[PDB]
Short mmCIF file of all heavy atoms in Angstrom, two decimals:
data_model
loop_
_atom_site.label_atom_id
_atom_site.label_comp_id
_atom_site.label_asym_id
_atom_site.label_seq_id
_atom_site.Cartn_x
_atom_site.Cartn_y
_atom_site.Cartn_z
N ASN A 1 -115.10 -239.79 -49.59
CA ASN A 1 -115.26 -241.25 -49.62
C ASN A 1 -114.02 -241.93 -50.20
O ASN A 1 -114.10 -242.81 -51.06
CB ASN A 1 -116.52 -241.66 -50.38
CG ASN A 1 -116.53 -241.19 -51.82
OD1 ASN A 1 -117.04 -240.12 -52.14
ND2 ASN A 1 -115.96 -242.00 -52.70
N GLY A 2 -112.85 -241.52 -49.70
CA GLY A 2 -111.61 -242.12 -50.14
C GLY A 2 -111.16 -241.72 -51.53
O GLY A 2 -110.24 -242.33 -52.08
N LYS A 3 -111.79 -240.70 -52.12
CA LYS A 3 -111.43 -240.22 -53.44
C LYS A 3 -111.07 -238.74 -53.36
O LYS A 3 -111.73 -237.97 -52.67
CB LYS A 3 -112.57 -240.43 -54.44
CG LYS A 3 -112.24 -239.98 -55.86
CD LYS A 3 -111.05 -240.74 -56.42
CE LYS A 3 -110.74 -240.30 -57.85
NZ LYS A 3 -109.57 -241.02 -58.42
N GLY A 4 -110.00 -238.37 -54.07
CA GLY A 4 -109.56 -236.99 -54.08
C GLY A 4 -110.54 -236.11 -54.83
O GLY A 4 -110.87 -236.39 -56.00
N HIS A 5 -110.96 -235.01 -54.22
CA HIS A 5 -111.88 -234.07 -54.85
C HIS A 5 -111.47 -232.64 -54.53
O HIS A 5 -111.17 -232.31 -53.37
CB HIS A 5 -113.31 -234.33 -54.39
CG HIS A 5 -113.89 -235.60 -54.93
ND1 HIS A 5 -114.42 -235.70 -56.20
CD2 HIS A 5 -114.03 -236.83 -54.37
CE1 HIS A 5 -114.85 -236.93 -56.40
NE2 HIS A 5 -114.63 -237.64 -55.30
N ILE A 6 -111.45 -231.80 -55.55
CA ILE A 6 -111.35 -230.35 -55.39
C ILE A 6 -112.78 -229.83 -55.29
O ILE A 6 -113.52 -229.85 -56.28
CB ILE A 6 -110.60 -229.70 -56.55
CG1 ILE A 6 -109.36 -230.52 -56.91
CG2 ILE A 6 -110.22 -228.27 -56.20
CD1 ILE A 6 -108.28 -230.48 -55.87
N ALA A 7 -113.17 -229.38 -54.10
CA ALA A 7 -114.52 -228.92 -53.83
C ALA A 7 -114.57 -227.39 -53.85
O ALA A 7 -113.62 -226.71 -53.45
CB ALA A 7 -115.00 -229.43 -52.47
N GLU A 8 -115.70 -226.87 -54.32
CA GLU A 8 -115.88 -225.43 -54.50
C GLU A 8 -116.94 -224.93 -53.53
O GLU A 8 -118.00 -225.54 -53.37
CB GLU A 8 -116.29 -225.10 -55.93
CG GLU A 8 -116.47 -223.61 -56.19
CD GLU A 8 -116.95 -223.32 -57.60
OE1 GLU A 8 -117.40 -224.26 -58.29
OE2 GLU A 8 -116.89 -222.14 -58.02
N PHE A 9 -116.65 -223.80 -52.88
CA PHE A 9 -117.59 -223.11 -52.01
C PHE A 9 -117.78 -221.70 -52.54
O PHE A 9 -116.80 -220.96 -52.68
CB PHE A 9 -117.10 -223.09 -50.56
CG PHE A 9 -117.03 -224.45 -49.93
CD1 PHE A 9 -115.96 -225.29 -50.16
CD2 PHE A 9 -118.05 -224.88 -49.10
CE1 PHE A 9 -115.90 -226.54 -49.57
CE2 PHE A 9 -118.00 -226.13 -48.51
CZ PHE A 9 -116.92 -226.96 -48.74
N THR A 10 -119.02 -221.33 -52.82
CA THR A 10 -119.35 -220.02 -53.36
C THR A 10 -119.82 -219.09 -52.26
O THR A 10 -120.43 -219.51 -51.27
CB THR A 10 -120.43 -220.13 -54.44
OG1 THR A 10 -121.63 -220.64 -53.86
CG2 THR A 10 -119.98 -221.06 -55.56
N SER A 11 -119.53 -217.80 -52.44
CA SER A 11 -119.93 -216.79 -51.48
C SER A 11 -120.03 -215.44 -52.19
O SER A 11 -119.53 -215.27 -53.30
CB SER A 11 -118.96 -216.70 -50.30
OG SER A 11 -119.38 -215.73 -49.36
N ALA A 12 -120.69 -214.49 -51.52
CA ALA A 12 -120.80 -213.13 -52.02
C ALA A 12 -120.25 -212.09 -51.06
O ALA A 12 -120.10 -210.93 -51.45
CB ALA A 12 -122.26 -212.80 -52.34
N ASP A 13 -119.96 -212.46 -49.81
CA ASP A 13 -119.44 -211.52 -48.83
C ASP A 13 -118.32 -212.12 -47.99
O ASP A 13 -117.91 -211.49 -47.00
CB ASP A 13 -120.56 -211.02 -47.91
CG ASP A 13 -121.40 -212.15 -47.36
OD1 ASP A 13 -121.39 -213.25 -47.95
OD2 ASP A 13 -122.07 -211.95 -46.32
N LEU A 14 -117.82 -213.30 -48.34
CA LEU A 14 -116.78 -214.02 -47.60
C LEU A 14 -117.18 -214.28 -46.15
O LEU A 14 -116.32 -214.33 -45.26
CB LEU A 14 -115.44 -213.27 -47.65
CG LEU A 14 -114.84 -213.00 -49.03
CD1 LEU A 14 -113.37 -212.65 -48.91
CD2 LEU A 14 -115.04 -214.18 -49.96
N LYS A 15 -118.47 -214.44 -45.89
CA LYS A 15 -118.95 -214.78 -44.55
C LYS A 15 -119.86 -216.00 -44.55
O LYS A 15 -119.81 -216.79 -43.60
CB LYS A 15 -119.68 -213.58 -43.94
CG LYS A 15 -118.74 -212.46 -43.51
CD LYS A 15 -119.51 -211.27 -42.96
CE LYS A 15 -120.28 -210.55 -44.05
NZ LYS A 15 -121.04 -209.38 -43.53
N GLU A 16 -120.68 -216.18 -45.58
CA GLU A 16 -121.52 -217.36 -45.72
C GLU A 16 -121.10 -218.10 -46.98
O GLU A 16 -121.07 -217.51 -48.07
CB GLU A 16 -123.00 -216.97 -45.79
CG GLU A 16 -123.55 -216.39 -44.50
CD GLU A 16 -123.63 -217.41 -43.39
OE1 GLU A 16 -123.73 -218.62 -43.69
OE2 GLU A 16 -123.59 -217.01 -42.21
N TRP A 17 -120.79 -219.38 -46.84
CA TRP A 17 -120.27 -220.19 -47.94
C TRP A 17 -121.23 -221.34 -48.21
O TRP A 17 -121.65 -222.04 -47.29
CB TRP A 17 -118.88 -220.73 -47.61
CG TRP A 17 -117.87 -219.64 -47.44
CD1 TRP A 17 -117.60 -218.94 -46.31
CD2 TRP A 17 -116.99 -219.13 -48.45
NE1 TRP A 17 -116.61 -218.02 -46.54
CE2 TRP A 17 -116.22 -218.11 -47.85
CE3 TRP A 17 -116.78 -219.43 -49.80
CZ2 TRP A 17 -115.25 -217.40 -48.55
CZ3 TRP A 17 -115.83 -218.71 -50.49
CH2 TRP A 17 -115.07 -217.71 -49.87
N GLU A 18 -121.56 -221.54 -49.49
CA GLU A 18 -122.42 -222.63 -49.92
C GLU A 18 -121.62 -223.59 -50.78
O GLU A 18 -120.96 -223.17 -51.74
CB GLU A 18 -123.63 -222.10 -50.70
CG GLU A 18 -124.54 -221.19 -49.89
CD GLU A 18 -124.07 -219.75 -49.88
OE1 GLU A 18 -123.26 -219.39 -50.75
OE2 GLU A 18 -124.52 -218.99 -49.00
N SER A 19 -121.66 -224.87 -50.44
CA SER A 19 -120.91 -225.89 -51.17
C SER A 19 -121.58 -226.13 -52.52
O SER A 19 -122.69 -226.65 -52.58
CB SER A 19 -120.83 -227.17 -50.36
OG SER A 19 -120.18 -228.20 -51.09
N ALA A 20 -120.90 -225.76 -53.60
CA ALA A 20 -121.43 -225.96 -54.95
C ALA A 20 -121.01 -227.31 -55.52
O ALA A 20 -120.46 -227.40 -56.62
CB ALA A 20 -121.00 -224.82 -55.86
N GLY A 21 -121.27 -228.38 -54.77
CA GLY A 21 -120.90 -229.71 -55.22
C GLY A 21 -119.40 -229.90 -55.27
O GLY A 21 -118.63 -229.28 -54.52
N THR A 22 -118.97 -230.77 -56.18
CA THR A 22 -117.55 -231.06 -56.38
C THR A 22 -117.07 -230.37 -57.65
O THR A 22 -117.63 -230.59 -58.73
CB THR A 22 -117.32 -232.57 -56.46
OG1 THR A 22 -117.63 -233.17 -55.20
CG2 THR A 22 -115.87 -232.85 -56.81
N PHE A 23 -116.04 -229.54 -57.51
CA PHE A 23 -115.56 -228.77 -58.66
C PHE A 23 -114.77 -229.64 -59.63
O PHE A 23 -114.95 -229.54 -60.85
CB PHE A 23 -114.72 -227.59 -58.16
CG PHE A 23 -114.18 -226.73 -59.25
CD1 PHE A 23 -114.98 -225.77 -59.85
CD2 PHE A 23 -112.86 -226.85 -59.66
CE1 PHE A 23 -114.49 -224.97 -60.86
CE2 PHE A 23 -112.36 -226.05 -60.67
CZ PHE A 23 -113.18 -225.10 -61.27
N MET A 24 -113.89 -230.51 -59.11
CA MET A 24 -113.14 -231.45 -59.93
C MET A 24 -112.84 -232.70 -59.12
O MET A 24 -112.87 -232.69 -57.89
CB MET A 24 -111.82 -230.87 -60.46
CG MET A 24 -111.92 -229.63 -61.32
SD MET A 24 -110.52 -229.47 -62.44
CE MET A 24 -110.45 -231.13 -63.11
N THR A 25 -112.53 -233.78 -59.83
CA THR A 25 -112.07 -235.03 -59.24
C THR A 25 -110.58 -235.18 -59.49
O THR A 25 -109.99 -234.44 -60.29
CB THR A 25 -112.83 -236.23 -59.80
OG1 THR A 25 -112.46 -236.44 -61.17
CG2 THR A 25 -114.33 -235.99 -59.73
N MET A 26 -109.96 -236.14 -58.81
CA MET A 26 -108.52 -236.27 -58.92
C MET A 26 -108.14 -237.49 -59.76
O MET A 26 -109.00 -238.18 -60.32
CB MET A 26 -107.93 -236.30 -57.51
CG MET A 26 -108.28 -235.04 -56.75
SD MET A 26 -107.06 -233.75 -56.81
CE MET A 26 -105.86 -234.51 -55.76
N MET A 27 -106.84 -237.76 -59.87
CA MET A 27 -106.29 -238.62 -60.91
C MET A 27 -105.58 -239.80 -60.25
O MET A 27 -104.59 -239.61 -59.54
CB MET A 27 -105.34 -237.80 -61.79
CG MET A 27 -105.82 -237.57 -63.23
SD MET A 27 -105.99 -239.00 -64.30
CE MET A 27 -104.68 -240.02 -63.68
N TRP A 28 -106.08 -241.01 -60.51
CA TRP A 28 -105.71 -242.22 -59.77
C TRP A 28 -105.55 -241.95 -58.28
O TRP A 28 -104.50 -242.21 -57.68
CB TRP A 28 -104.45 -242.90 -60.32
CG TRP A 28 -104.33 -243.01 -61.80
CD1 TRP A 28 -103.24 -242.66 -62.56
CD2 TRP A 28 -105.31 -243.51 -62.72
NE1 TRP A 28 -103.49 -242.91 -63.89
CE2 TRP A 28 -104.75 -243.43 -64.01
CE3 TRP A 28 -106.60 -244.02 -62.58
CZ2 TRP A 28 -105.45 -243.84 -65.15
CZ3 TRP A 28 -107.29 -244.42 -63.71
CH2 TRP A 28 -106.71 -244.33 -64.98
N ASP A 29 -106.62 -241.43 -57.67
CA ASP A 29 -106.72 -241.18 -56.23
C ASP A 29 -105.44 -240.60 -55.64
O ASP A 29 -105.04 -240.96 -54.52
CB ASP A 29 -107.11 -242.47 -55.49
CG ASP A 29 -106.14 -243.61 -55.72
OD1 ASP A 29 -105.09 -243.67 -55.04
OD2 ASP A 29 -106.42 -244.46 -56.60
N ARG A 30 -104.80 -239.69 -56.36
CA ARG A 30 -103.60 -239.02 -55.87
C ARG A 30 -104.02 -237.86 -54.97
O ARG A 30 -105.20 -237.69 -54.63
CB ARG A 30 -102.73 -238.54 -57.03
CG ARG A 30 -101.97 -239.65 -57.74
CD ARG A 30 -101.27 -239.10 -58.98
NE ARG A 30 -100.63 -240.15 -59.76
CZ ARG A 30 -99.98 -239.94 -60.90
NH1 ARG A 30 -99.88 -238.73 -61.43
NH2 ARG A 30 -99.43 -240.98 -61.53
N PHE A 31 -103.06 -237.03 -54.57
CA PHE A 31 -103.34 -235.84 -53.77
C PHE A 31 -102.54 -234.67 -54.32
O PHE A 31 -101.34 -234.80 -54.58
CB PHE A 31 -103.00 -236.07 -52.30
CG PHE A 31 -103.80 -235.22 -51.36
CD1 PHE A 31 -105.01 -235.67 -50.84
CD2 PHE A 31 -103.36 -233.95 -51.01
CE1 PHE A 31 -105.75 -234.89 -49.99
CE2 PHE A 31 -104.10 -233.16 -50.15
CZ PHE A 31 -105.30 -233.63 -49.64
N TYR A 32 -103.21 -233.54 -54.51
CA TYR A 32 -102.59 -232.32 -55.01
C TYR A 32 -102.43 -231.34 -53.86
O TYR A 32 -103.20 -231.38 -52.89
CB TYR A 32 -103.41 -231.67 -56.13
CG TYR A 32 -103.66 -232.54 -57.35
CD1 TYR A 32 -104.59 -232.16 -58.30
CD2 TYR A 32 -102.94 -233.71 -57.56
CE1 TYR A 32 -104.82 -232.94 -59.42
CE2 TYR A 32 -103.16 -234.49 -58.67
CZ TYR A 32 -104.11 -234.10 -59.60
OH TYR A 32 -104.33 -234.88 -60.72
N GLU A 33 -101.45 -230.45 -53.97
CA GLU A 33 -101.18 -229.45 -52.95
C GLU A 33 -101.21 -228.07 -53.58
O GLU A 33 -100.64 -227.86 -54.65
CB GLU A 33 -99.84 -229.70 -52.27
CG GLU A 33 -99.80 -230.98 -51.46
CD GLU A 33 -100.69 -230.92 -50.23
OE1 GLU A 33 -100.99 -229.80 -49.77
OE2 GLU A 33 -101.09 -231.99 -49.74
N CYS A 34 -101.89 -227.14 -52.91
CA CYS A 34 -101.95 -225.74 -53.33
C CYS A 34 -102.50 -225.58 -54.75
O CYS A 34 -101.78 -225.13 -55.65
CB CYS A 34 -100.59 -225.08 -53.20
SG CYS A 34 -99.72 -225.47 -51.66
N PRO A 35 -103.76 -225.94 -54.99
CA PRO A 35 -104.34 -225.71 -56.31
C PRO A 35 -104.54 -224.23 -56.57
O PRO A 35 -104.77 -223.43 -55.66
CB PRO A 35 -105.69 -226.45 -56.24
CG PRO A 35 -106.04 -226.41 -54.80
CD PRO A 35 -104.74 -226.51 -54.05
N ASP A 36 -104.44 -223.86 -57.85
CA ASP A 36 -104.62 -222.46 -58.25
C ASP A 36 -105.21 -222.44 -59.65
O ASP A 36 -104.60 -222.94 -60.59
CB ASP A 36 -103.28 -221.72 -58.21
CG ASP A 36 -103.39 -220.28 -58.69
OD1 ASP A 36 -104.52 -219.75 -58.77
OD2 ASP A 36 -102.34 -219.67 -58.98
N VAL A 37 -106.39 -221.85 -59.78
CA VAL A 37 -107.10 -221.75 -61.05
C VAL A 37 -107.06 -220.30 -61.51
O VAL A 37 -107.41 -219.39 -60.75
CB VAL A 37 -108.56 -222.24 -60.92
CG1 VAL A 37 -109.25 -222.20 -62.27
CG2 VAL A 37 -108.59 -223.64 -60.34
N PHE A 38 -106.64 -220.09 -62.76
CA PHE A 38 -106.56 -218.75 -63.31
C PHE A 38 -106.81 -218.81 -64.81
O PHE A 38 -106.99 -219.89 -65.38
CB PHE A 38 -105.21 -218.09 -62.99
CG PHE A 38 -104.03 -218.91 -63.40
CD1 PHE A 38 -103.45 -218.74 -64.65
CD2 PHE A 38 -103.48 -219.85 -62.54
CE1 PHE A 38 -102.36 -219.49 -65.03
CE2 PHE A 38 -102.39 -220.60 -62.92
CZ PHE A 38 -101.83 -220.42 -64.17
N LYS A 39 -106.82 -217.64 -65.45
CA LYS A 39 -107.01 -217.53 -66.88
C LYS A 39 -105.91 -216.67 -67.47
O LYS A 39 -105.60 -215.60 -66.93
CB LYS A 39 -108.39 -216.94 -67.21
CG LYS A 39 -108.65 -216.76 -68.70
CD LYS A 39 -110.04 -216.21 -68.96
CE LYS A 39 -110.26 -215.95 -70.44
NZ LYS A 39 -110.06 -217.18 -71.25
N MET A 40 -105.31 -217.13 -68.57
CA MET A 40 -104.22 -216.43 -69.24
C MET A 40 -104.64 -216.18 -70.69
O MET A 40 -104.33 -216.97 -71.58
CB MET A 40 -102.93 -217.22 -69.16
CG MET A 40 -102.32 -217.27 -67.77
SD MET A 40 -101.08 -215.99 -67.52
CE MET A 40 -99.87 -216.45 -68.76
N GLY A 41 -105.33 -215.07 -70.92
CA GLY A 41 -105.70 -214.66 -72.26
C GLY A 41 -106.92 -215.37 -72.81
O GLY A 41 -108.01 -214.79 -72.87
N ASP A 42 -106.74 -216.63 -73.22
CA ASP A 42 -107.82 -217.39 -73.84
C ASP A 42 -107.93 -218.81 -73.29
O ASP A 42 -108.71 -219.60 -73.83
CB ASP A 42 -107.63 -217.45 -75.36
CG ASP A 42 -107.66 -216.07 -76.01
OD1 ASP A 42 -108.52 -215.25 -75.61
OD2 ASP A 42 -106.83 -215.82 -76.90
N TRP A 43 -107.18 -219.14 -72.25
CA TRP A 43 -107.19 -220.48 -71.68
C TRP A 43 -107.30 -220.40 -70.17
O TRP A 43 -106.86 -219.42 -69.55
CB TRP A 43 -105.93 -221.27 -72.06
CG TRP A 43 -105.80 -221.54 -73.53
CD1 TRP A 43 -105.49 -220.64 -74.50
CD2 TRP A 43 -105.96 -222.80 -74.18
NE1 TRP A 43 -105.45 -221.26 -75.73
CE2 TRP A 43 -105.73 -222.59 -75.56
CE3 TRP A 43 -106.26 -224.09 -73.74
CZ2 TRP A 43 -105.81 -223.62 -76.49
CZ3 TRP A 43 -106.34 -225.11 -74.67
CH2 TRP A 43 -106.12 -224.87 -76.03
N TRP A 44 -107.88 -221.44 -69.58
CA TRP A 44 -107.98 -221.57 -68.13
C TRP A 44 -107.01 -222.65 -67.67
O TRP A 44 -107.04 -223.77 -68.18
CB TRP A 44 -109.41 -221.90 -67.71
CG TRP A 44 -110.32 -220.72 -67.73
CD1 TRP A 44 -110.99 -220.23 -68.81
CD2 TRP A 44 -110.66 -219.88 -66.63
NE1 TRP A 44 -111.74 -219.14 -68.45
CE2 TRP A 44 -111.55 -218.90 -67.11
CE3 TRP A 44 -110.31 -219.86 -65.28
CZ2 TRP A 44 -112.09 -217.91 -66.30
CZ3 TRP A 44 -110.84 -218.87 -64.47
CH2 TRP A 44 -111.72 -217.91 -64.98
N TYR A 45 -106.17 -222.31 -66.70
CA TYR A 45 -105.12 -223.20 -66.22
C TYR A 45 -105.30 -223.46 -64.73
O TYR A 45 -105.52 -222.53 -63.95
CB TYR A 45 -103.74 -222.60 -66.48
CG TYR A 45 -103.45 -222.33 -67.93
CD1 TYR A 45 -103.43 -221.03 -68.42
CD2 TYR A 45 -103.18 -223.37 -68.81
CE1 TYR A 45 -103.16 -220.78 -69.75
CE2 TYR A 45 -102.91 -223.12 -70.15
CZ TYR A 45 -102.90 -221.83 -70.61
OH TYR A 45 -102.63 -221.58 -71.94
N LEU A 46 -105.21 -224.73 -64.35
CA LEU A 46 -105.19 -225.16 -62.95
C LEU A 46 -103.80 -225.72 -62.67
O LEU A 46 -103.42 -226.75 -63.24
CB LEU A 46 -106.28 -226.19 -62.67
CG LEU A 46 -106.08 -227.05 -61.42
CD1 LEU A 46 -106.03 -226.21 -60.16
CD2 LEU A 46 -107.16 -228.11 -61.33
N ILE A 47 -103.06 -225.06 -61.79
CA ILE A 47 -101.71 -225.46 -61.43
C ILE A 47 -101.72 -226.02 -60.01
O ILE A 47 -102.41 -225.49 -59.13
CB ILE A 47 -100.73 -224.27 -61.56
CG1 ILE A 47 -99.31 -224.69 -61.18
CG2 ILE A 47 -101.19 -223.09 -60.72
CD1 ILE A 47 -98.60 -225.46 -62.27
#
């Protein structure tokens, strides 16, 4: 609806995907490219 959203789809066999709502929203309706979520020791980073 005209707003940037990082959406998450969950699966268990990479064949059937269920949309688990919206994972994150974006920042002043900007657009991000190539998101990557990982964990480094004790923190979670989205680049």
Side-chain angles (χ1 to χ4, degrees):
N1 60 267
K3 182 60 179 179
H5 290 279
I6 317 291
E8 182 184 14
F9 294 81
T10 63
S11 182
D13 49 339
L14 302 197
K15 287 178 290 180
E16 293 291 335
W17 297 85
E18 298 85 18
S19 176
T22 294
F23 180 80
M24 301 205 48
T25 69
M26 301 265 288
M27 248 295 327
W28 317 131
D29 58 83
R30 286 173 185 178
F31 207 91
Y32 301 167
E33 294 292 337
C34 316
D36 177 16
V37 183
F38 54 92
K39 179 178 176 58
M40 290 265 298
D42 298 318
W43 296 72
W44 283 84
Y45 301 107
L46 160 61
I47 180 78

